Amino acid sequence: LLRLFESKLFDISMAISYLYNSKEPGVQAYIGNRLFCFRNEDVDFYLPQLLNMYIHMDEDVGDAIKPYIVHRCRQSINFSLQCALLLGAYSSDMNSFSSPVRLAPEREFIKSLMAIGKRLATLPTKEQKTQRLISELSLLNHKLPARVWLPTAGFDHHVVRVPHTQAVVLNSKDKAPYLIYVEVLECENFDTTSVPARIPEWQEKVRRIREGSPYGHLPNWRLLSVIVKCGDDLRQELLAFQVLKQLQSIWEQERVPLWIKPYKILVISADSGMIEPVVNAVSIHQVKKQSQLSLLDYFLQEHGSYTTEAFLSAQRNFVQSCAGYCLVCYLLQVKDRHNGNILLDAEGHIIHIDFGFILSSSPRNLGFETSAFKLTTEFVDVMGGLDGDMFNYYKMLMLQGLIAARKHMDKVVQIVEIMQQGSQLPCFHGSSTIRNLKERFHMSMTEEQLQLLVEQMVDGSMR
Numbered sequence: 001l002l003r004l005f006e007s008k009l010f011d012i013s014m015a016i017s018y019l020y021n022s023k024e025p026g027v028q029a030y031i032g033n034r035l036f037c038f039r040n041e042d043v044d045f046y047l048p049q050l051l052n053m054y055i056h057m058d059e060d061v062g063d064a065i066k067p068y069i070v071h072r073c074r075q076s077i078n079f080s081l082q083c084a085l086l087l088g089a090y091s092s093d094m095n096s097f098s099s100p101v102r103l104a105p106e107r108e109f110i111k112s113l114m115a116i117g118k119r120l121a122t123l124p125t126k127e128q129k130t131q132r133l134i135s136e137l138s139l140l141n142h143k144l145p146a147r148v149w150l151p152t153a154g155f156d157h158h159v160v161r162v163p164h165t166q167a168v169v170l171n172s173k174d175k176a177p178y179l180i181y182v183e184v185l186e187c188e189n190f191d192t193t194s195v196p197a198r199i200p201e202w203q204e205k206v207r208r209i210r211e212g213s214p215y216g217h218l219p220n221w222r223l224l225s226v227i228v229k230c231g232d233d234l235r236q237e238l239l240a241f242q243v244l245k246q247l248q249s250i251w252e253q254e255r256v257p258l259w260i261k262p263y264k265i266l267v268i269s270a271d272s273g274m275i276e277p278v279v280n281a282v283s284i285h286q287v288k289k290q291s292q293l294s295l296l297d298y299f300l301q302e303h304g305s306y307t308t309e310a311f312l313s314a315q316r317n318f319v320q321s322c323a324g325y326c327l328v329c330y331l332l333q334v335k336d337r338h339n340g341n342i343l344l345d346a347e348g349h350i351i352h353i354d355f356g357f358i359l360s361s362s363p364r365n366l367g368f369e370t371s372a373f374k375l376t377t378e379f380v381d382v383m384g385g386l387d388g389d390m391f392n393y394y395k396m397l398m399l400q401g402l403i404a405a406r407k408h409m410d411k412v413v414q415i416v417e418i419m420q421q422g423s424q425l426p427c428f429h430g431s432s433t434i435r436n437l438k439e440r441f442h443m444s445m446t447e448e449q450l451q452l453l454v455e456q457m458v459d460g461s462m463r
Contacts, residue, residue, distance in 0.1 A: 003027065010034065012042045013411050016049060019064065020418050032064030040072065044079075045245070048238065048267075049418040051086040056094050056422035074098060077191055081106060081151060089235060089267045094422050096147075097191060109148040109159075112140060113180075114272060117230030121174045129169040133178055138164040145196050150182060150224055152264050152276045156190035157222070159183070163209045175231030179277060181205065183213060186220040202346075203279055227275040234273030236425055238265040240355030242415045243332055247405065250412075251324070254404035258324035258397055259317065261351050278353065280346045285339035296381040303348060314348030318382055319390050321349030322375075323397040328352070329373040330457065331405065331412070331440055336363045336371045359416070360433050361426035375461040399447075399454050409441045 001021040005014070015038070019031040035043060043050075050069070054062045073080040081103055096102055116136050120129040145160040161183040169178040187193045201214035206223045210216035244262035251258045264276035284295070291298050299318075304310030329337065335357040343351040352373075357363050363371055384391040405412065416437060420428045427433065442453065 001027075012038055012046065013414060016046055016418070017410070017414055019061070020049075020053060020414075025060075028058075028060050028064040032066070032068060035065075035068040036071070040076075043068075043072075045242075047082055048086055048090070048242070049415065051083060052090050052419055052421055055087065055091050075191075077102065078149065078151060078156070085266075085268055089270045090422075092270060092424055095191075095194060105147045106149070109143075109146070110268060113228050114230050114268070116140075117178065117228055120169065120176060120178070124172065126169050126172045126176070129172075129176060129178070130167070133169055134164045134167050137162060137167050137180065140164075145185075145198065147195050149190060150184065150226060150274075151266050152226055152274060153184065153224055155222075156187040157184040157220075158187065158190075158196055160185050160196060160215050160221075161213060163213070166205065166209065170227070175229075177227050177229040177232065179225060179227045181209060182224045182226065183209070183215060184222055184224055185215065185218060186222055225277050225279070227277050229273045229275065231271055232273060233269075233271050234265055234267050234275070235270065235423075236358060236361070236427055237273070237275070237355045238267050239416060239419055239427070240332065240334075240358055241265045242419075243412060244328060246408075246412055246415065247324075247328060247331075247401075250404055250408045251401055254400075254407065256397070256400050256404055257320050258327065258401045259321040259349055260324040260328055261345075261349070263353070278343060278345070278351050281343035281351050282345075283340060284342050284344055284350070287344060288339070294381065295378050298344075299348065299382060315382060315390070317347055317349045319394050320397060321351070322379065322383075323394050324401065325350060325352050326373055326375070326457075326461070327398055327401045327405065331437070333359050333436075333440070334373065335361070337373045338371065357427075359427040359437070360429035373461070374463065375458065377462065380462070395454055395458060398457070399451055402450055402454065403447065406441055406443060409438070409443065413437055413441075 001018045003022070003024050005018060015031050015034060019028060022028065050065050054065050054069075069079075069083055073083060077097060084103065116133065119136065120133065123129050123132060141162055141164065144162070145158050148159050149157050150159060159182055163181050163183065167178065167180040169176055171177070185196050199214035209223060210221060213221070215221050241262050241264070244260055248260060248262060261278065263278055266274035266276075268274060282290075287293075287295065287298050291301065293301060299311060299314055300306070303314035304312070325342075328334070329352070332355075334352070334355065336354070337352070341352060341354050343353060345351060357371075380386060380388075380391065383394060413434065417434055420433065442450065445453065
């Protein structure tokens with residue numbers, strides 16, 4: 001990056017860009033110095049890129065980023081957790097606050113949940129884990145409240161109680177994950193305001209938890225959920241998260257209706273993680289079993305009838321959501337798609353989860369056929385028909401997105417590119433990985449050929 005940004009107008013991502021790219025001697029320190037000039041909310045999104053560059057790059061580069069993080073660690077305890085964890089995970093093959101015990105409670109709390117998860121390997125069947133999971137988890141209230149929080153929460157807080165009885169285990173595997181509801185009281189600033197005290201005393205689980213809760217009567221009291229995956233590496237899933245979030249912005253910016261829901265991801269380790277779960281949405285395989293209906297019939301059942309606003313509105317959300325996830329999958333080269341991967345929210349979008357196979361990483365065995373977003377003939381019904389009032393909407397939507405993506409391409413590729421350094425992940429295969437990302441954007445293509453490319457995409461999808 002050539003010096004020669006002496007033209008204009010910095011933006012956080014361009015900064016990240018010069019910082020990663022320039023081979024010039026004075027500039028890296030320089031960007032490190034302008035980082036201070038940025039909204040802390042905006043830089044934070046880039047945390048994993050900052051510590052990755054830190055870990056696997058030049059001393060010039062690490063010394064550059066160094067002072068920003070120290071300034072931010074000092075000011076934000078949650079921030080320090082983040083840096084700590086990230087430093088753990090991204091290196092392989094390479095008021096008590098600002099005192100050594102500062103993150104101690106928190107550590108034990110995470111260590112706790114993770115240990116709970118590991119202990120579930122002996123019990124072969126799901127229901128056994130659950131009953132034992134609640135049995136183990138209940139104890140943990142002995143320790144609460146405390147100075148501990150769920151990094152997932154977009155707001156400062158203290159975790160005051162865990163409604164143990166409502167915890168659940170999702171599968172029977174050894175490394176089987178588990179969902180749990182966690183009550184918390186909200187702060188203005190975690191760092192300043194101190195720990196609260198005991199009272200040993202749909203999404204409406206909330207209502208019944210609160211009514212059944214000692215702290216429930218509170219104004220702050222808010223309920224959170226997390227999926228605690230003790231043996232599953234989330235670093236890739238996270239990268240997926242980063243790209244989803246970005247495309248979300250981009251389309252918001254270019255005023256493109258497309259609809260996707262990035263859900264938060266917490267990398268607690270190289271084998272560990274936590275995921276903010278999607279709520280009120282269901283699995284489509286579940287819908288087929290439970291309802292014993294065509295997807296279209298499910299809609300006609302669940303939201304209104306052909307001319308109801310319930311229906312019309314649901315199905316619009318289906319199309320926009322469907323279009324967005326087709327674009328996301330395409331660009332990101334997502335794989336291992338199937339009915340357990342795609343949800344349906346109560347309002348009728350679809351939501352893709354389990355971003356484990358992306359970019360260069362392909363699932364094994366599976367010799368015969370690619371595992372990928374397919375537009376099923378069952379879908380096409382919900383939309384219209386191949387020739388259908390809204391199927392043409394679907395296509396254009398994809399096109400408009402595909403365009404705006406091209407506009408902002410740099411932002412998107414930047415996230416993945418930086419994260420490649422020193423990674424052992426499967427999604428990275430040399431310089432293919434980036435090369436084919438870019439070619440996937442077709443920068444050189446005219447909107448005509450793009451409209452066509454889309455036509456080919458869709459036809460190519462249904463097979």
